[PDB]
């Protein structure tokens, strides 16, 4: 089952969380981690947040303390693995044996085909190197165009506006945060960004670019000094595909993290896995999944009596004055709005229900509500809906009881 030695491909959050849990759970055999970035393992959420603003990479490193006795091969790329021979081929000419192989290779930004031959700066934002490159171009009064209205693009928009950068944003869908964000939240977020001076363009797509100017499918133009593309990510599943594992923009895994290849597991952004709320497979793209799935897979490898991964999805986003938290599903058959939705000191909570059962929640500038809502969500609570609306109600009381 858990056969030594353990080899993990990728040295991001999922990998670090996994190897720390292996050690904490009592596994004492070899652990070797192969990471292609020549960087002390680091967390990505700061890259479009405080790092983009203040630039200190020594504030964003992951804690590998709970992972003693691990050899981290940084700056080296796993090029293939042979699941029959139980070996991994590295870019430095070495080969690693494994008893258990764990693919934690994450995902990479999708390129925008229409900007392939661009002769102006076009960047994506995934790595520390990416963040440093973008930051170097955030000149005050310069013009930035962001393609894509997902959370990372919006976080960059906010950061850029704070830095005195003019920002335009092109979104093909009619709303921001089209993936896993309630419409009510998305509409409010657009109003917020518009009020901060972001030039939002909905239902437009980029058709190309010429001499520092981007072209749109409504026949118009947007001049910019830099483009940052953020239209989503694609799983880094090439090694799995080549080795014969089941993959489709993501490695399919069960709740134990098992791939279709015996002795090969996968975790984090690279996986396509069951969302327990929808009961469908999806590629989850969140910090909490990377950490939680890594921990759960490790725990069950060391102790097979442990349950499989079962945590429900959630994320957060920091966009200027908006501290956004979202859990579960973006929609059901009912939304309850707790508080007023207003640009004047924004503070509200949304609750999504399905036939009376909580299936999702949102908090904007209300961290205290979010924890009890996630507990109610976890057990599929069916609370009195007037109480959920009634601002006199205390959610922590409800969650404990």
Ligand X SMILES: Cc1cc2nc3c(=O)[nH]c(=O)nc-3n(C[C@H](O)[C@H](O)[C@H](O)COP(=O)(O)OP(=O)(O)OC[C@H]3O[C@@H](n4cnc5c(N)ncnc54)[C@H](O)[C@@H]3O)c2cc1C
Instruction: Indicate whether 325 belongs to the interface with ligand X (CB under 6 A).
Output: no
Q: 280 touches which of its own copies, ligand X, none (CB within 5 to 8 A by kind)?
A: its own copies
Q: 248 touches which of its own copies, ligand X, none (CB within 5 to 8 A by kind)?
A: its own copies
User: Alpha helices, DSSP H only, in 136-204?
Assistant: 151-162, 183-195
What minimum distance in Å lies between the beta carbon of 300 and its own copies? 10
Instruction: Indicate whether 329 belongs to the interface with ligand X (CB under 6 A).
Output: no
Label residue 245 exposed, middle or buried (CB < 10 Å: 0-12, 13-18, 19+): buried
Instruction: Indicate whether 239 belongs to the interface with ligand X (CB under 6 A).
Output: yes
**Region near ligand X per CB under 6 A, out of 56-64, 100-108, 138-146, 378-386:** 100-108
Pick the closer one to ligand X by CB: 281 or 287. 287
| C-alpha to C-alpha distance for 312 and 260, rounded to whole angstroms | 23
Q: 256 touches which of ligand X, its own copies, none (CB within 5 to 8 A by kind)?
A: its own copies
Site for ligand X in 250-269 (CB under 6 A): 268-269
| C-alpha to C-alpha distance for 74 and 12, rounded to whole angstroms | 11
Instruction: Indicate whether 292 belongs to the interface with ligand X (CB under 6 A).
Output: no
Instruction: Indicate whether 132 belongs to the interface with ligand X (CB under 6 A).
Output: no
Pick the closer one to ligand X by CB: 11 or 388. 11
Q: 21 touches which of its own copies, ligand X, none (CB within 5 to 8 A by kind)?
A: none
**Hey, what are 217's tokens?**
């499918």
Q: 239 touches which of ligand X, its own copies, none (CB within 5 to 8 A by kind)?
A: ligand X
| C-alpha to C-alpha distance for 191 and 197, rounded to whole angstroms | 10
What contacts 96, CB < 8 A, 6 or more positions away?
5, 7, 32, 34, 87, 88, 90
Pick the closer one to ligand X by CB: 81 or 209. 81
Pick the closer one to its own copies by CB: 281 or 287. 281
Closest listed residue to residue 231, CA positions, set 131, 336, 107: 107
Q: 366 touches which of its own copies, ligand X, none (CB within 5 to 8 A by kind)?
A: none
Instruction: Indicate whether 285 belongs to the interface with ligand X (CB under 6 A).
Output: yes
Beta strands of 177-302 (E only): which ranges? 199-202, 206-210, 213-216, 221-223, 226-229, 233-235, 251-252, 264-266, 271-275, 280-282
**Hey, what are 390's tokens?**
């009634």
Instruction: Indicate whether 178 belongs to the interface with ligand X (CB under 6 A).
Output: no
Residues that bind its own copies (CB under 8 A): 244-246, 248, 252-256, 258-262, 273-274, 279-281, 308
Kindly write down the DSSP assignment for every residue of 136-151, as one continuous string: TT--TT-EEEEE--SH
What minimum distance in Å lies between the beta carbon of 289 and its own copies? 16
**Hey, what are 358's tokens?**
């909580």
Taking residues 59 to 78 in sequence order and writing x for each that binds ligand X by CB under 6 A, - otherwise, the string is ------------------xx
| C-alpha to C-alpha distance for 17 and 282, rounded to whole angstroms | 21
Q: 14 touches which of ligand X, its own copies, none (CB within 5 to 8 A by kind)?
A: ligand X
**Region near ligand X per CB under 6 A, out of 221-229, 310-318, 328-336, 345-353:** 310-318
Q: 299 touches which of ligand X, its own copies, none (CB within 5 to 8 A by kind)?
A: none
Residue 114 DSSP symbol? G
Instruction: Indicate whether 236 belongs to the interface with ligand X (CB under 6 A).
Output: yes
What contacts 386, CB < 8 A, 6 or more positions away?
none
| C-alpha to C-alpha distance for 337 and 183, rounded to whole angstroms | 12
Pick the closer one to its own copies by CB: 27 or 252. 252
What are the Cα distances from residue 257, in Å, to 56, 75, 80, 101, 261?
34, 26, 20, 11, 11
SS3 103: strand
Q: 142 touches which of ligand X, its own copies, none (CB within 5 to 8 A by kind)?
A: none
């Amino acid at each position: 089952a858990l056969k030594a030695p353990v080899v993990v491909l990728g040295a991001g959050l999922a990998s670090v969380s996994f190897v720390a849990e292996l050690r904490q759970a009592g596994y004492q055999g070899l652990i070797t981690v192969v990471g292609d970035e020549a960087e002390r393992p680091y967390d990505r959420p700061p890259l479009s947040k405080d790092f983009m603003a203040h630039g200190d990479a020594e504030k964003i490193r992951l804690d590998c303390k709970r992972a003693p006795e691990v050899e981290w091969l940084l700056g080296v790329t796993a090029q293939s693995f042979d699941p029959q021979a139980h070996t991994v081929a590295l870019s430095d000419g070495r080969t690693l044996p494994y008893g258990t192989l764990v693919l934690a290779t994450g995902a990479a930004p999708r390129a925008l085909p229409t900007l392939q031959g661009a002769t102006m700066p076009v960047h994506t934002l995934r790595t520390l190197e990416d963040a440093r490159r973008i930051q170097a171009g955030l000149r005050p009064q310069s013009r930035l165009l962001i393609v894509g209205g997902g959370v990372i693009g919006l976080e960059l928009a906010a950061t850029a506006r704070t830095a005195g950068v003019h920002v335009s944003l092109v979104q093909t869908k009619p709303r921001l945060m089209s993936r896993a964000a309630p419409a009510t939240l998305a509409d409010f977020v657009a109003r917020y960004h518009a009020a901060q001076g972001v030039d939002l363009r909905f239902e437009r797509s980029v058709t190309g670019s010429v001499d520092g100017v981007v072209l749109l499918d409504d026949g118009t133009r947007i001049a910019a000094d830099m483009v940052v593309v953020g239209i989503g990510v694609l799983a880094n599943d090439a090694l799995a595909r080549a080795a014969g594992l089941a993959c489709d923009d993501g490695i399919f895994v069960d709740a134990y993290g098992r791939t279709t290849c015996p002795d090969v597991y996968a975790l984090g952004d690279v996986t396509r896995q069951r969302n327990p709320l929808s009961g469908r497979f999806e590629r989850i793209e969140t910090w909490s999944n990377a950490q939680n799935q890594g921990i759960a897979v490790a725990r069950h490898l060391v102790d097979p009596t442990a349950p499989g991964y079962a945590e429900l999805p959630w994320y957060w986003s920091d966009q200027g004055a908006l501290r956004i938290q979202v859990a579960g599903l973006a929609s059901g058959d009912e939304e309850i709005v707790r508080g007023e939705v207003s640009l004047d000191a924004p503070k509200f909570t949304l609750i999504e229900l399905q036939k009376g059962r909580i299936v999702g929640a949102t908090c904007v500038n209300n961290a205290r509500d979010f924890a009890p809502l996630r507990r109610l969500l976890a057990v599929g609570a069916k609370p009195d809906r007037a109480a959920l609306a009634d601002p006199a109600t205390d959610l922590r009381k409800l969650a404990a009881a």
